[PDB]
Amino acid sequence: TLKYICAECSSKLSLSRTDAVRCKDCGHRILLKARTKRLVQFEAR
Amino acid sequence: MIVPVRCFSCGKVVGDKWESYLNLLQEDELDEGTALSRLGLKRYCCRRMILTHVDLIEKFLRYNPLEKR
Amino acid sequence: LRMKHGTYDKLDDDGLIAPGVRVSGEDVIIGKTTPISPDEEELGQRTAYHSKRDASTPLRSTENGIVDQVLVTTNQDGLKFVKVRVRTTKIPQIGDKF
Amino acid sequence: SEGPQVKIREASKDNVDFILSNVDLAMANSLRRVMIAEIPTLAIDSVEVETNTTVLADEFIAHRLGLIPLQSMDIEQLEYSRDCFCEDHCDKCSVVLTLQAFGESESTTNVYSKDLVIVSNLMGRNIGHPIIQDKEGNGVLICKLRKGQELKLTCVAKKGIAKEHAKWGPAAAIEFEYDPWNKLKHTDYWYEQDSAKEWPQSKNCEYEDPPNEGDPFDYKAQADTFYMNVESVGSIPVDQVVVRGIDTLQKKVASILLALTQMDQD
Amino acid sequence: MNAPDRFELFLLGEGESKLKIDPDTKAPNAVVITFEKEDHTLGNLIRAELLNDRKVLFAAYKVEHPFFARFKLRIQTTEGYDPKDALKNACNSIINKLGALKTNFETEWNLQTLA
Ligand SMILES: [Zn+2]
Ligand SMILES: [Zn+2]
Ligand SMILES: [Zn+2]
């Protein structure tokens, strides 16, 4: 459901609630939440 | 970590002189003072911007990207 | 029950805010709930619908910034745990020490 | 004409060295301050980041983008965004640039300000283009990408003055000197053994007669004949810095006159 | 956190006027004019031009605090000379001198051909 990226192999995964947090390609148990798709506004000062 | 766009004191744009500063040192074999004077940095406020800059972005680029497309 | 007065709208379905989202003071960045004993009588606003209480992690009351990185993993015990990094500018102002 | 006199000693693309004569100290200093802080200029004001996989922070990149000098020749045709009736920004009060960079190369791809692309309708004006000065044709080094890193963002550039933020200042360093021989005695020269030997003569000492070292102190003499050197960041031409500074100071004084007449009529 | 907005250096706020002229009871024929959203750039110029007026007995300006972009200008003129008219004459002479300076700089720049 929610997009994550494995910390070492950098493969995009989709994890649901019941899924254990673990990479399906290289098995690294550290996953990063994907950057938000909404545009974020910064003042250039 | 990357070259500042402008000189802090006066506001001269020094961010476009960084890549030509390195060329004046490595392939023209100039010392740093003549390389600074050649680029037009005559005030020492501008000279300290390029002369004392540390290019830490080169060390940051050796790490693999976390989000790779 | 016992929800914090800060906003929860920045959280996703997993109770975690996505990286890149701007946060402000006393905003929830990690959402967590714990079950309670049903059918109690406390604070007046207690009903049978309130099966949980909020154990969420808000931001610091004065701090703000951007969520830089949200890291989900398991500890040694296998329990899921998260680390949320918030990034901000410290621009020098009156009273900063040099 | 009668009034302040200008003799330009040197002129360049980004430097004008002139002698401002027959003028008071206050008006020369006010012109210097107005050129530094009061000329309206176009600079990137808001950054909306879509993708940032660089090693630099979003707010880091936004601060670097604000300091990019943009062309501001026709900035008077642009409107202040606070004075515009749009909701956030439009073509009447802003210029919208975009920046899309990808690290498709194995080596590091440098992201320059020449990669900024105007996507708003300029309406035939002469604003929004990033200023290119070096011979290589690239602009200011904005960022660096390794392979697979992406930077997609949209900048909105609005007009402003350097009093609001120094990114709107086109004046760089303004050299300002008067009385190089200290004939007005406005400085008491610190020295160890000899003030004339230990203090180097300025380059402007050739443009004034040295004192005769026997003549009495001229108490009636005032400060005139200012030696000024305006340097341009590149946003406007270096002559337009001086002309727009005179115009801005004139507009400030005229606004004071207008307010005085408006409360005189009441 | 407590930092004021920078446009408060040059933008008149709600319910704030550009000038605010009060009579001064210390000396006869003297006024104090509060300039809002201005600084030493206007104050020094106006004061030094008012001191060139022959019928002006006193002309001074002060920025009471650097936090607030405002300055007070005290003008005392001779009898029968309105200090508002002295301010008008000083402003007009500044306008004329700046116009002459602009024309002179434009002509001298057009003489330059190495740009
Ligand atoms: Zn993996
Ligand atoms: Zn400098
Ligand atoms: Zn608009």
Coordinates of C-alpha atoms and ligand atoms in Angstrom, one line a residue, chain B residues 7-12 43 45-46, ligand 2:
Chain B
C7 CA 30.6 36.7 -1.9
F8 CA 29.4 37.0 1.7
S9 CA 30.7 40.6 2.2
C10 CA 30.1 42.4 -1.0
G11 CA 27.8 40.2 -3.0
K12 CA 29.9 39.5 -6.1
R43 CA 39.0 42.3 -3.1
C45 CA 36.5 39.5 0.7
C46 CA 36.0 37.8 -2.7
Ligands
ZN2 ZN 33.5 40.3 -2.2

